[PDB]
Each structure stands twice: as C-alpha cells, then as structure tokens.
Amino acid sequence: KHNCFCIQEVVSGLRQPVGALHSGDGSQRLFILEKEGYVKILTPEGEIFKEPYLDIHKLVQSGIKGGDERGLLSLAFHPNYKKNGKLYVSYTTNQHDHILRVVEYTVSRKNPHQVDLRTARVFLEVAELHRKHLGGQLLFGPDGFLYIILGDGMITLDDMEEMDGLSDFTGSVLRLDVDTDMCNVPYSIPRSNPHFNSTNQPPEVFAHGLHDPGRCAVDRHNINLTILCSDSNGSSARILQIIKGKDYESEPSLLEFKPLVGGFVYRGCQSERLYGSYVFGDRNGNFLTLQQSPVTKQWQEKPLCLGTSGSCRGYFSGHILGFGEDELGEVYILSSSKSQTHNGKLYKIVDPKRPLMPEECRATVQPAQTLTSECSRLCRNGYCTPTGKCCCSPGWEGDFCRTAKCEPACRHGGVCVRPNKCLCKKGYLGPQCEQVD
Ligand SMILES: O=S(=O)(O)OC[C@H]1O[C@@](COS(=O)(=O)O)(O[C@H]2O[C@H](COS(=O)(=O)O)[C@@H](OS(=O)(=O)O)[C@H](OS(=O)(=O)O)[C@H]2OS(=O)(=O)O)[C@@H](OS(=O)(=O)O)[C@@H]1OS(=O)(=O)O
Ligand SMILES: O=S(=O)(O)OC[C@H]1O[C@@](COS(=O)(=O)O)(O[C@H]2O[C@H](COS(=O)(=O)O)[C@@H](OS(=O)(=O)O)[C@H](OS(=O)(=O)O)[C@H]2OS(=O)(=O)O)[C@@H](OS(=O)(=O)O)[C@@H]1OS(=O)(=O)O
Ligand SMILES: [Ca+2]
C-alpha cells in the first residue's frame, strides 16, 4: 500500500461547510461556503477572516435535519472576476414549500473581501415542493457560459400537472450567457443551446433527466467540455457524462460496478500521477478513480486508497459534505461531525510521494485589489452587466446613467435633478417651473 494518498487538516471551526473554491484573481484566497448562508475567506497563509465575505443567513432558509438540503447550495465566480467583481450564488429561501434562487452579486468597491449586499440581481427563482433532490451547483465552462445543475426536487408528474407555476427547470442542466449588453433581461440564451428560439422547451435547458445529482466534475483540459455527474434515483447510484440536448431518464451509467457525494477532475500541481484523473467519493471517504479507455471510450473504476504518512493521515473526522478546489488546482474535503456547533473541517488531499511544494508549483500571491472597471466607478443609477454595460434604472440615461429624464421638460432654466423632478429657479413654480411668480 505505497500508492495511497493522505489527508491534511487545514482548518476547523467551520459550521456545516458545503464546498470551497477560489476566485481566479491571483490572490489564492479560498472561499468556504457554510450551509446556513455564509461565505468565509481562508487566506493562503491559513487565516480565516473574521468578517464573512458574504452573509445572507437572514435571506437563506436552511434545515436542521441532515437530509434537509435547504440552505446555501453553490457559488461561482465570473471568469473575469478580477476586473468585474461578479459572483453567482444559489440558495433556498421562503416566499409552495420554498424557492431556489440563483442570484448575482458584485464585490464591494471599497473592500475586496466583502460583497456589497445591495447589488443582488436575481437570475432565477425555481419553485420547490420538497427538501431533497435540489442540486444547485453553479459552474462556468471553458465556453464562458454559466451552467446550473438542478435535481428533480422529488417533483412527481401529478404534482406538476396539477400545480401550475412550477418552474419546469427542475431535473435539468441549464446553460446561460451572462455576458449580455441587453438590459431587458438578466442573461441571454446561448445560440448553441439546443432549444434556442424553440417554444416547445425552455431555452435555458441544455440537458435534462437528472434526478439526485452530486457535485459534478468539470474538466478544463482539449476538445469541447466534459462534465461528469453522479446521480442516485433511490441503490440506483449511476454516473452520467453530460452532453448537449440529452435526456438522462432511464439512462445507464458509464459504470456497472457501482452513495456518492460527487467528484472532481484533478488539475493541481502537487501530484503528478493524479493529474487528469476523475475522482469520486462517498460520504465515508471511499474514493474511486474513473479512467476512460482511448480505444473503446468505455469507463472503468479503480479504488483510491488513503494511508497515513506522518501527520498526513489516512482518515478524517465525520462525513464528507463537499469538495473544494484552490487557485493552484489542489483539492479538498469538507467534512462535519455531530458532537461542537462548529465541528466542520477543511482537509487537503496530498500525494505523499511528492514534496508539498515542488519547484514547478511555486506561484506568487497577487493580493486582491479593489475594482477598477470604469462601469463600477461611474454607474451610479442602475446596474453593471458583467460586460461593463451600465443599465439605467427607470428615469435615467447617459453613458453611466448620470442624467435624469424629465417628461415634460423643466422650464425657465430648471434642472432635471431626479426622474421627473425639476429644481426650479426662484420665482418659478409648478412641477416643470412653468408658473411665473
Ligand atoms: O443513507 S445515508 O447513508 O446517505 O445517510 C443519510 C441519511 O441520514 C439520515 C437518516 O439515516 S438513517 O437513520 O440511517 O436511516 O439522518 C439521520 O440519521 C443518520 C444516520 O447515519 S448513517 O450513517 O446513515 O447510519 C445521521 O447521520 S450520522 O451522523 O448518525 O451518521 C443523520 O445526521 S447527518 O446526516 O449526519 O446530518 C441523522 O440526522 S440528524 O443529523 O441526526 O438530525 C437522513 O438525513 S436527515 O433526515 O436529514 O437527518 C439521510 O437520509 S435521507 O433519506 O436523505 O433523509
Ligand atoms: O425518518 S424518516 O423516515 O421520517 O425520514 C425523514 C424523512 O422522512 C419523511 C418523509 O420521507 S419519506 O417517507 O421517506 O418519503 O417522513 C416520513 O417518515 C415517517 C415515518 O417514520 S419511520 O420510522 O422512518 O417510518 C413519517 O412519520 S409517521 O407519521 O409515519 O410517524 C412521516 O410523516 S411526516 O412526513 O412527518 O408527516 C413520513 O412522511 S410520509 O409518510 O412520506 O408522508 C420526512 O419527514 S417530514 O418531511 O418532516 O414530514 C423526512 O424528510 S424531510 O423532508 O427532510 O423532513
Ligand atoms: Ca447536492
């Protein structure tokens, strides 16, 4: 047993952590998601900032029982967050049982370590009848589009035919183009989408037929895009390769051998031998590798063992709640135990055959800077699209929505100050300064 990997505790004191990811800005911050509705920052020196990066625990409806999937579900940073400060979160909230929101946020202009809560911009609201099979994973592909993985919500045919106003998004991989200059809608539909300009099915839907998906593995590489998801109907533990336009109802898995939390594609630097592997794990820490045959394109699973090497250990506390990836590509376990309140932990996966810092893995921290995009500076009245288009609130216009509109116009030298509000010169009265005193 010389081929094993091992697990290194990085931080503890977390409250039900569900995942972790970086923001791609060079700062090597790791953002840890906590189920009740928090996002904490872990610095590359290993400190957790006191102030959460994002606190939406009052907006978030979370569940005390473990099988209750309600809470904060996923987070994705825009590929160009370093310049536009855009991020996307999915979470459950109250309004029949609850609503699954996908919302855009922008980091604050003054503080690169805190989101501006005022910049919430709702993209989707998906009705939910039950508290399982939710999904919620947000991710960006090499194409630059935003993918959204939704489970079936345990919604039956009778539930949907009877109750109108159910979203029809449940059970689907949605693909959005968030880089729009259009102001009438929060996102535009990619033309590559299979139901683009098609009245029969929602244009957002990229694929469907998902039931209870885990965290899906996303490969970056060099042809197109590969997304592998675990799914368990309810036992029925299958793994699916996501392709455009496919219906995965009664679809076999890539594997017959053999519930899984999810998986990841290792693109880190610390392990050479693991580079490019698809890895999936269950809640108890049993891990497997998926290898595709270049010849047949069939998939095969092999076990991946953990073993102790010094303080890099072959075991960890509690159950795996989620996975993480840092800006260097290394991967993490998020686990929690019952016990006290904050018994959640962040662990790193380590290849003990290799140094912790091989020469080629060195990378200089570029500390996070405040936004400098022209839009964020000057877009006073309205919101900025991820492209930098300043979208005016009603009653405003100009390149950055600085000039208010007055219809009819202010008279006698009056100034249009706010929408349809005229500041009159002394001696002139009325809503447009039209009456002479
Ligand atoms: O089936 S699983 O192995 O994936 O387990 C997940 C289910 O755990 C439940 C019910 O499990 S059961 O009692 O064994 O039928 O939650 C409650 O029980 C488990 C028992 O764990 S065990 O390893 O499956 O035996 C508790 O976990 S444990 O800490 O005792 O290991 C649950 O706590 S938790 O899942 O760790 O958060 C316990 O709930 S509670 O935290 O004590 O309140 C179901 O989850 S629950 O209903 O949300 O509590 C899960 O099954 S479900 O069908 O998805 O509901
Ligand atoms: O321990 S549980 O079996 O309760 O697992 C927790 C989830 O089970 C529900 C519904 O899930 S399901 O039945 O698997 O589809 O509760 C259901 O199970 C118990 C039976 O207890 S038992 O010992 O596990 O058999 C019922 O309680 S009882 O009245 O039979 O004593 C539940 O009734 S109720 O839903 O609480 O009203 C029964 O629901 S049902 O027969 O399917 O309608 C869920 O409980 S609930 O949602 O709180 O009502 C649990 O899922 S949860 O949504 O995460 O809470
Ligand atoms: Ca999930």
Residue from 65, 130, 320 whose mutation best tests the ligand 1 pocket (most atoms within 8 A of CB): 65
Residues 382 and 285 in one domain: no
86 SS3 class: strand
- Cβ atoms of 155 and 210 within 8 Å: the answer is no
CA atoms in the 13 A half-sphere facing the CB of 198 = 15
Q: Is 68 in the pocket of ligand 1 (CB under 6 A)?
A: yes
Residues 250 and 146 in one domain: yes
Residues 384 and 243 in one domain: no
Q: How far apart are CA 14 and CA 100, in angstroms?
A: 24
Per-residue tokens: 100: 């699954």
Nearest ligand 1 atom to the CA of 338 is 29
Q: How far apart are CA 41 and CA 54, in angstroms?
A: 9
Largest CA distance in the chain: 96
Q: Where is the domain boundary, 328, 350, 372?
A: 350
Q: Where is the domain boundary, 329, 350, 371?
A: 350
Experimental approach: X-ray
Residues 366 and 275 in one domain: no
CA 142 to chain centre: 15
Closest-approaching ligand to the CA atom of 229: 3
Q: How far apart are CA 28 and CA 210, in angstroms?
A: 33
Q: Is 65 in the pocket of ligand 1 (CB under 6 A)?
A: yes
Q: Is 259 in the pocket of ligand 1 (CB under 6 A)?
A: yes
Residues 314 and 409 in one domain: no
β-bridge partners, 383: 391
Nearest ligand 1 atom to the CA of 63 is 48
Q: How far apart are CA 312 and CA 384, in angstroms?
A: 46
157 SS3 class: helix
Residues 318 and 206 in one domain: yes
Q: How far apart are CA 200 and CA 157, in angstroms?
A: 18
Residues 377 and 231 in one domain: no
Nearest ligand 2 atom to the CA of 67 is 54
Residues 279 and 179 in one domain: yes
Total domain count, the chain: 2
Closest-approaching ligand to the CA atom of 72: 3
Residue 240 CB partners (closer than 8 Å, separation 6+) = 210, 228, 229, 230, 231, 248, 251, 253, 254
With CA atoms as reference, report the closest residue to 128 among 160, 153, 163, 107: 153
Residues 244 and 313 in one domain: yes
What is the resolution of the experimental data for this entry, in Å?
A: 2.4
Q: Where is the domain boundary, 330, 350, 370?
A: 350
Quick one: DSSP state of residue 24? Answer: S
Per-residue tokens: 318: 């509690």
177 in a known ligand binding site: no
Domain that holds residue 296: 1-350
Nearest CA, atom 47, ligand 1: 67
Residues 213 and 123 in one domain: yes
Residues 334 and 396 in one domain: no
Residues 262 and 406 in one domain: no
